[PDB]
């Protein structure tokens, strides 16, 4: 369990310095917590940068798109910093940070790919969910193309299967802006 300082828990103390963590999978709970923290920080000061550290294998697309929209929505710039892994919705959040303020530590791993899903039921219902998952796939691809500056087709091609990049490769792909090794 979490350490206390001065009386805050450790994460509360960092929140005081506008530092937010996404750690582990993206689900409704973890997404909402991040969103509440971002809204809180904007309330505290709508002009100061926020620092959003990411270490996530991804998870639920709808939960994650909420976090992503909240980032574009609030007034403060949201700088992103990958501190281990950003895959699936992880990489999308990372790449959706404020322009020029997307970072990774040197040894992180970044992974992009297409949506996973599935429905059992009537042919009719499978059609409906298959069409919708196809729309979602196209729209995630368009968010990646926008943030990376890659062509849509390039994004499509590169997400067909699990695509793993080191920090330096992700910066060259446009998923982030800087690899940082030292505070200095």
The token duo for 56 is: 């996530």
Stretch 31-70: interaction string toward Mg ion, x if CB under 5 A: ----------------------------------------
The Cα–Cα gap between 42 and 112 comes to 29
Residue 116 touches which member of Mg ion, a second copy, none, C-beta under 5-8 Å by kind: a second copy
The residue sitting closest to Mg ion, measured at its beta carbon, is 74
Q: Coil, helix or strand for 85? A: strand
By CB under 8 A, the count of residues binding a second copy is 93
Q: Which is nearer to a second copy, 114 or 150 (CB)?
A: 114
The Cα–Cα gap between 35 and 69 comes to 10
Q: Which of residues 139-168 bind a second copy (CB under 8 A)?
A: 139, 143, 160-164, 166
Q: Coil, helix or strand for 25? A: coil
The Cα–Cα gap between 11 and 14 comes to 5
Q: Which is nearer to Mg ion, 49 or 158 (CB)?
A: 49
Active-site residue, 88 included: yes
Residue 51: beta bridge partners?
A: 19, 79
Q: Which of residues 58-117 bind a second copy (CB under 8 A)?
A: 62-66, 68-70, 72-75, 83-85, 105-109, 113-117
Active-site residue, 29 included: no
Q: Which is nearer to Mg ion, 77 or 158 (CB)?
A: 77
Residue 149 touches which member of a second copy, Mg ion, none, C-beta under 5-8 Å by kind: none
Shortest reach from residue 154's CB to Mg ion, in Å = 26
49 contributes a contact to a second copy by CB under 8 A: no
CA nearest to 95, candidates 112, 107, 70: 112
The token duo for 166 is: 């080191």
The Cα–Cα gap between 150 and 153 comes to 8
The Cα–Cα gap between 34 and 52 comes to 9
Which of the following is catalytic: 88, 91, 104, 108? 88
Active-site residue list: 88, 113
């Amino acid at each position: 369990l979490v350490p206390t300082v001065i009386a805050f828990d450790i994460y509360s103390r960092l929140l005081k310095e506008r530092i937010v963590f996404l750690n582990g999978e993206v689900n409704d709970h973890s997404a909402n917590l991040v969103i509440a923290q971002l809204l809180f920080l904007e309330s505290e000061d709508p002009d100061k940068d926020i620092y959003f550290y990411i270490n996530s294998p991804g998870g639920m697309v709808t939960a994650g798109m909420g976090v992503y929209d909240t980032m574009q929505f609030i007034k403060p710039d949201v700088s992103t910093i990958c501190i281990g892994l950003a895959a699936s919705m992880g990489s999308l959040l990372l790449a959706g940070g404020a322009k020029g303020k997307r970072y990774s530590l040197p040894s992180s791993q970044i992974m992009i790919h297409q949506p996973l899903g599935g429905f059992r039921g009537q042919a009719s219902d499978i059609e409906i969910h298959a069409k919708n998952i196809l729309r979602i796939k196209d729209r995630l691809n368009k968010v990646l193309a926008h943030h990376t500056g890659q062509d849509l087709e390039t994004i499509v091609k590169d997400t067909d299967r699990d695509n793993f990049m080191m920090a330096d490769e992700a910066k060259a792909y446009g998923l982030i802006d800087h690899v940082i090794e030292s505070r200095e």
